[PDB]
């Protein structure tokens, strides 16, 4: 048999239950959000993970195919480091790490025969290769005196269950497949350098990439979906979005205020700069 | 005949057409969404509703049954109170209020098996109670001074049209059913304390819970929908959602702006605290 | 024959292939993000598209049709204009125009029968004129100075491919069909008034409806889709979207240190008042 098969196992007028085993090379990507907080650039808010798209491009045996991948992270512990109440001391409220407790999302899908009208499926089985997520070296930028770097922080991810998910963008929207991955503490810890603290296992939320352009994993996926009889159908990919209307407008709001502040500080600033 | 039956009112070689009658619980919540202008602290922008989703886990008869419920208001009516044009006289440049004339919109979904892979749905009905909602006590808060309250508020919600709808999250998608409300006011009027209103019907959007950790109304809904007749296909539930990307963008510059704009005024503040 | 066909192409037990060929009337609109930086106000940061959704109701030949169509833009190129490093020139960081590499996309539906069920379709085509796309004009409001005006600019928006796409909203959720345009320049340039720049063509990112209601297309389109022979089957449609709740609370903690910093200010400028 092929490695890149697909068989009917049943066909009726219209429909048709068809089986496809394929393999594919899941390329993702973490992505992190940094929020500072005010005042001087002593205190940091959060440091926490954002849902990563990534799409690319891979040849398959004689054919391309392309691909579109989207990374999460669940059930992460919230840390927190503060070591002193005044604006001059390094403070970060709430950052995020990855332990046994929690788990990596992976949603993909491809331009192949597979992923166009699937709705439906069972007997949904794959078989993945564990990988190894190692985190990089975020400096924190302080205003003035010293920097310190988180740097460090490895973690292994073995393949878990499977499921389906829908991946949600302002351009397309996918029905796709959700590959699970539990973790395992790896011996590279995470230390934040010039500070009091080092030797803890996980990854941190800062640059998790460790300067890479994706994390590889290749495996076998093997499932059963319902797929019109006429290879001709398609269904609605691309989108056009227009949620969070209400945000747009708080943010507008906020950003006209903020324009108003501004003004009246620049302008208090050039009375007292207008001898 | 059952009270939670399953019904096939017919059977092709893949498909089916399954009748579904079953009880439920809509234990459902509000969640409004409070916005302060700049300034001192006496002018507030606007006092809205937010579509506010609870999942919870309620017992069937002799099941344990896992719901998601989704709450939402439109038409709601844009009341406004301005005691001048100061910075010190307490103002609401705009606040909803529910009335008859708006609408009140519900999506239930279960893990049961109505639920699994509903795309279709004819013959829809369903047979509500109506209930009572009551509106919270909500202190503004003052930089200084006395500290008003809204309180009040009664409206009765009544049973009206059933239809399908969808509740999109950051983590699930559930294809669900939407039960309408219609609205009738009650003897409870809300008003403001140590102002200048009162006597006038509706339901505040500044705690419409009333501190009630949910709203609770039975129902039974029937209807009959398109499910494969292998018990084993599954539907895409879960998400990884990276939508408004720009607004995120946005949301960045405008940080990096204020952040910006607060250690320009720090410095300006700390230079003046070397003596 | 008929212009607004229902033709059953084939039909099993449950499902069958429907063919519709039907003239619609595509209304469709532009909408513009204009950013304006912090500052004094003679700097913007940028000015951008947004998708923009407009929904209507039109005559067809004896029907009442009610329709919803969601305008988007790809490939837009960004032009930047700065007059100098100081806080009173008047700068454009960033500003969109739309030119021949771009494409326009038109997301349109209806509630006529072709789109209450579709999920699938094939033999998709469409017969779309040629219509005029031209600026308006969009004054800068420097608070002090002259007055900039960006005015002009017309493109011709030729037909091409027709797919399939889904309209998300706040609202609705719409398995829609996306009629694809391409662009010509035409003779009126578009440019920025008392400032040296002229000549250039495309479409500004700032006025694009030129103060209309919405730009008007005729179109036919045809395909093949496939329905529940019951022609009682609804798919769901509305929705209660709670999507990027991490982006609300980022704009929430943004909100309160912009509040705190506000009030900062204000109680600094209010103490120099008590004489």
Same mark, same amino acid.
């Given at each position: 048999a092929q490695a890149n098969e697909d068989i009917v196992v049943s066909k009726t007028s219209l429909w048709k239950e068809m089986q496809y085993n394929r393999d594919i090379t899941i390329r993702f990507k973490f992505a992190s959000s940094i929020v500072k907080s005010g005042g001087l650039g002593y205190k940091w808010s959060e440091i926490s993970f954002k849902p990563?798209? =990534?799409?690319?491009? =891979?040849?398959?045996?004689?054919?391309e195919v392309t691909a579109h991948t989207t990374?999460? %992270?669940?059930? +992460?512990?919230?840390?927190?480091?503060?070591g002193g109440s005044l604006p001059t001391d390094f403070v970060i409220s709430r950052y995020e790490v990855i332990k046994e407790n929690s788990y990596v999302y992976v949603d993909y899908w491809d331009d192949s025969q597979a992923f166009r009208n699937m709705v439906y499926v069972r007997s949904l089985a794959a078989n993945l290769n564990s990988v190894i997520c190692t985190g990089g070296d975020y400096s924190f930028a302080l205003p003035v005196?010293?920097?310190? %770097? +988180?740097?460090g922080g490895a973690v292994s991810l073995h393949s878990a269950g499977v499921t389906l998910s829908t991946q949600f963008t302002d351009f397309v929207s996918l029905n796709s497949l959700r590959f699970r991955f539990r973790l395992t503490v790896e011996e590279p810890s995470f230390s934040i350098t010039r500070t009091r603290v080092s030797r803890l296992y996980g990854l941190p939320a800062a640059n998790p990439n460790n300067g890479k352009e994706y994390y590889e994993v290749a495996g076998r996926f093997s499932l059963i979906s319902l797929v019109p009889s006429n290879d001709d159908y398609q269904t609605p990919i691309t989108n056009s979005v227009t949620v969070r209307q209400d945000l747009e407008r708080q943010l507008g709001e906020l950003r006209e205020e903020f324009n108003a502040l501004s003004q009246e500080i620049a302008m208090s600033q050039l009375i007292d700069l207008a001898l």
């Open positions: 990563a798209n =990534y799409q690319y491009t =891979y040849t398959r045996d004689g054919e990374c999460s %992270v669940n059930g +992460m512990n919230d840390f927190n480091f503060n005196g010293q920097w310190p %770097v +988180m740097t």
